[PDB]
Design an enzyme around this catalytic site. Structure first.
Site: not given
Ligand SMILES: NC(=O)c1ccc[n+]([C@@H]2O[C@H](COP(=O)([O-])OP(=O)(O)OC[C@H]3O[C@@H](n4cnc5c(N)ncnc54)[C@H](OP(=O)(O)O)[C@@H]3O)[C@@H](O)[C@H]2O)c1
Ligand SMILES: NC(=O)c1ccc[n+]([C@@H]2O[C@H](COP(=O)([O-])OP(=O)(O)OC[C@H]3O[C@@H](n4cnc5c(N)ncnc54)[C@H](OP(=O)(O)O)[C@@H]3O)[C@@H](O)[C@H]2O)c1
Ligand SMILES: NC(=O)c1ccc[n+]([C@@H]2O[C@H](COP(=O)([O-])OP(=O)(O)OC[C@H]3O[C@@H](n4cnc5c(N)ncnc54)[C@H](OP(=O)(O)O)[C@@H]3O)[C@@H](O)[C@H]2O)c1
Ligand SMILES: NC(=O)c1ccc[n+]([C@@H]2O[C@H](COP(=O)([O-])OP(=O)(O)OC[C@H]3O[C@@H](n4cnc5c(N)ncnc54)[C@H](OP(=O)(O)O)[C@@H]3O)[C@@H](O)[C@H]2O)c1
Ligand SMILES: Nc1nc2ccc(SCc3ccc(C(=O)NCc4ccccc4)cc3)cc2s1
Ligand SMILES: Nc1nc2ccc(SCc3ccc(C(=O)NCc4ccccc4)cc3)cc2s1
Ligand SMILES: Nc1nc2ccc(SCc3ccc(C(=O)NCc4ccccc4)cc3)cc2s1
Lengths: 247, 248, 248, 248
Positions: D14, D135, D141, D154, D156, D158
């Site tokens: 992702r 950097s 979020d 969640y 809190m 972010k």
């Molecule tokens: N997607 C969106 O729409 C969206 C919206 C707002 C903000 N964001 C932010 O953007 C960033 C990336 O989004 P995303 O949708 O790609 O993320 P995601 O797929 O929900 O998670 C990214 C990776 O985080 C790792 N993770 C989860 N729990 C973990 C733990 N206990 N220890 C270590 N690693 C862990 C997992 O790795 P493994 O797969 O290797 O276990 C997962 O693949 C995140 O910070 C998210 O909060 C995303």
């Protein structure tokens, strides 16, 4: 028939002023304390002399751990045990000390994130689950202009803004309002010397002085009152303009 | 000896509820109006029956023009003439209507930016120049960051009003003058707006799926002018029942 | 064909650095100016020597008046007349001076609210009505919530400009026009300011204890207009070296 | 050797995967941190090493809060120095995300949502800085202030991450380390989610009625770590298509 309030960290300083002013307004109070046992018992004695059976103390450590949820459940339960109801939670207890990026670090995290954010969240969960209800969180007006080397403290206070918003939204359908009060400089740290205290006093636009604990408590009183029944998710700064001043 | 307040746009709706509540707290009040003379005089008659000689009216158009500064100076002067003092200014008068990007535009500018921001700024200067518990309260908008579609000039004017609230709080703090805001969400719906459009909005509000009464807005104004807010300046209190927390 | 951009206030300082960087990226540019005719014509001459028929000048006062809408219409028309298209608008021109609460006041309102907010609004309306990667960038101010003492009208205009950025991003998104801002902290200090005063400001900046270069401001503008910001709208990027995080 | 190196947490899939790929395309060597997705992380490292030998390694670690999290975060940073002799960029991307209604034990929910979203970024930031165009970029979020119902822990975590971004920008600015955020609105939607629910979200985005690609988010990260952002610290760029501007 009087409502009841829990105030955390209420033995001294701003939490004490909030407990006193809630009691003056008609509330029965739980005075939560961690270490300040003599001051907590002395305050409850003073309130009970004014109206008997209107104050109790409740001791608990609000550091994060696997037993923090039980301690927070106990704080709420003590209000219901003494008074048969719990109308108001004030999340006032707070750890505050520097944690430079360059006690073990996991204890720093447990204390600064536990007291400033996790404990409020768990007290909010226990308050809601046991139910003019309202919660007031003591926030920090300077959270976007933080003190150098206070990253964990600042993280916990930002987390507390997020809790105020998220819980105001989720608890609105139960009639529970959630708001915050954000002091700038109020009672300065006991540890702090007089020249340094003055240095902070001089930065405040409105009067070049710190807030009294009573001025902070006044905004808490408004937020729990009938004059704030449409207010939820709001944080009132009580900072004499400090947060408006540029570097 | 009784303090005195000016409330702009005080003949109806939220400004009336604020004038009543100040008067109930013991203030003498100037009821400012533009087109609502009958309503303003009716309010003044109701307040003076309760306590003689404690309410006057003052006419002024708050459109931006070469004469707005003279009009703002007259509103503040009318408080000093009637009552010998002016302790509180409530900037409540507001124009509100859409201005799509895709009345001449310069008239829309004079009304939406003139009433909502420039008149507050000129009233603030006159209030401060003519100078206790002195304070100004500006009626802001809790949805300033999630604006209504096609309300750019309105939104610009209310953002300008936040800027004035912060700049004036800083600049007047040395004079003991506090400057704060109250930001309603949905309160009394526009009289025109249909009753179905109004229902749609009420259902969005977390706290009780209803609008604020005017009196709930007035309650926050009363707090900010009171001795319980003596350390508060530059703060804007939302009174929106949680509406601004709700995502799309 | 090459895309085209209008940059307001582009004769000197940050607006010049933005027109140069858009030109180096392949844009044709309208260099708007008010008083700086020699500096404007000189810059167009330099850009035309590098690639011919790629720069024109356009004179306009952006003070608010009943003719501002026509002048903003004409700035946009000048880009269409020179280059057949107008892809990017940069609202950079700004008046900046103190307006203490304690020139006539109506002239200060017209200049500080006209150049900083009303002209951006009317240029945004004309840019959108005359309509690939279309966007508008507004030059905002990173310190809008910690304002300079006695600058209330300037601060009011820059807050209104944040309002316009959000409101126009919302309303023009359906047409594919993105609207974003760039918010400097201290960049090129005022020409009039003495070195001693410039150093007091420099010393406040955490990152490097120095002001931003015009080019550092222009780099963020170039990002927001690029294909690398194609999902970004309604965002304001601070380019302030951490200044807005520093407490009193 | 002269090529810089970056750590990306949660980089197997992702958004974090698209950030690792774009950093590698820009000439960075990369540490691909993962927790449970070993096969995806190794698959990415192999593709990147086929493109350029010895430019990618994987590193496994659970970022849930515990007494061993400090040691784990130290080891992630150490893995970048052992593999590549330097660590120029930290991207805090890994995130747990699930509802925690106020009305798994609660302490596990706390450890996972506050540890991954906020405490691990803080411990990684400490370890990064202790070991030193440097950097840090934190994935924030855009909807923090308009949170999803029943996501308090969640939300809190972010908000705590915004605080870290600002606090660490101020504290590390003297070492030349910049600290910034990128705040998606709706980007790649959950694997599980039906198209009909994904469409409810897509429809709410003003700019294009679609979610951001992972690449669009990665583009904003590339800008912040680049020489085009060398004066930017403490800033959070929203990449949300205008979503956060939309009222309920
Ligand atoms: N997607 C969106 O729409 C969206 C919206 C707002 C903000 N964001 C932010 O953007 C960033 C990336 O989004 P995303 O949708 O790609 O993320 P995601 O797929 O929900 O998670 C990214 C990776 O985080 C790792 N993770 C989860 N729990 C973990 C733990 N206990 N220890 C270590 N690693 C862990 C997992 O790795 P493994 O797969 O290797 O276990 C997962 O693949 C995140 O910070 C998210 O909060 C995303
Ligand atoms: N004072 C200011 O200028 C200022 C400025 C900004 C924000 N605030 C906020 O306003 C609130 C009140 O301020 P304050 O200066 O009165 O606070 P304080 O004196 O620093 O702390 C209040 C109480 O919190 C309790 N506490 C600390 N660690 C704890 C733990 N691990 N477990 C349980 N309780 C613990 C202590 O109780 P015992 O004494 O019983 O151990 C302490 O008396 C705080 O939330 C603070 O962050 C204050
Ligand atoms: N109602 C809500 O739900 C809501 C929501 C958000 C914010 N607000 C804010 O709260 C405040 C009061 O709201 P409201 O609904 O009571 O306001 P309103 O009814 O729209 O207007 C208040 C008064 O403003 C005066 N006004 C309008 N244009 C004027 C001009 N050119 N010159 C002088 N006066 C003029 C009118 O007085 P005359 O009648 O004498 O001509 C009007 O009765 C406003 O600042 C508004 O922007 C209200
Ligand atoms: N410089 C900083 O440190 C800083 C800090 C924060 C924000 N900003 C913002 O960044 C932008 C660029 O800053 P800057 O210092 O380069 O700006 P500046 O030099 O102060 O002004 C830029 C141009 O604005 C034009 N302008 C002034 N009044 C005008 C009028 N009535 N009609 C039309 N044009 C007018 C002038 O054009 P002519 O010379 O042709 O008359 C001037 O050269 C501005 O929006 C500023 O507010 C700058
Ligand atoms: N729980 C509490 N939170 C806060 C937040 C802010 C303030 S007043 C502002 C301020 C006061 C002291 C400092 C300072 O540098 N204090 C050193 C210090 C360290 C440990 C304990 C006490 C004081 C910085 C900012 C006071 C408090 S008390
Ligand atoms: N149009 C323009 N707007 C701005 C905004 C900020 C700045 S730099 C900061 C600064 C410069 C001058 C003063 C001053 O008091 N004169 C105060 C702060 C420079 C400019 S130039
Ligand atoms: N680690 C992650 N953090 C986030 C933050 C926001 C989003 S997209 C918006 C959204 C998606 C699913 C839900 C849901 O209820 N499941 C709610 C909001 C997706 C993610 S993935």
């Amino acid at each position: 028939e009087a409502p009841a309030a829990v105030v955390t960290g209420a033995a001294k300083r701003i939490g004490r002023a909030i407990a006193v002013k809630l009691h003056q307004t008609g509330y029965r109070v739980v005075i939560h304390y961690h270490n300040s046992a003599e001051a907590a018992v002395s305050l409850a004695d003073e309130l009970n002399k004014e109206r008997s059976n209107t104050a109790v103390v409740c001791q608990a450590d609000l550091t994060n751990s696997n037993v923090l949820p039980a301690s927070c459940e106990e704080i709420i339960n003590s209000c219901f045990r003494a008074f048969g109801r719990c109308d108001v939670l004030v999340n006032n207890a707070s750890a505050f000390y520097p944690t430079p990026l360059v006690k073990t670090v996991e204890t720093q995290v447990a204390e600064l994130i536990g007291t400033n954010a996790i404990a409020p969240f768990l007290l909010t969960m226990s308050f809601a689950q046991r139910q003019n209800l309202s919660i007031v969180n003591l926030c920090d007006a300077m959270v976007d202009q933080p003190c150098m080397a206070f990253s964990l403290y600042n993280m916990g206070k930002h987390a507390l803004v997020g809790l105020t918003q998220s819980a105001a939204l989720e608890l609105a359908p139960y009639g529970i309002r959630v708001n915050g009060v954000a002091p700038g400089v109020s009672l300065l740290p006991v540890a702090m010397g007089e020249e340094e205290k003055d240095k902070w006093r001089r930065k405040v636009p409105l009067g070049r002085r710190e807030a009294s604990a009573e001025q902070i408590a006044d905004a808490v009183i408004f937020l729990v009152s009938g004059s704030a029944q449409y207010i939820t998710g709001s944080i009132i700064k009580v900072d004499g303009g400090l947060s408006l001043v540029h570097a």
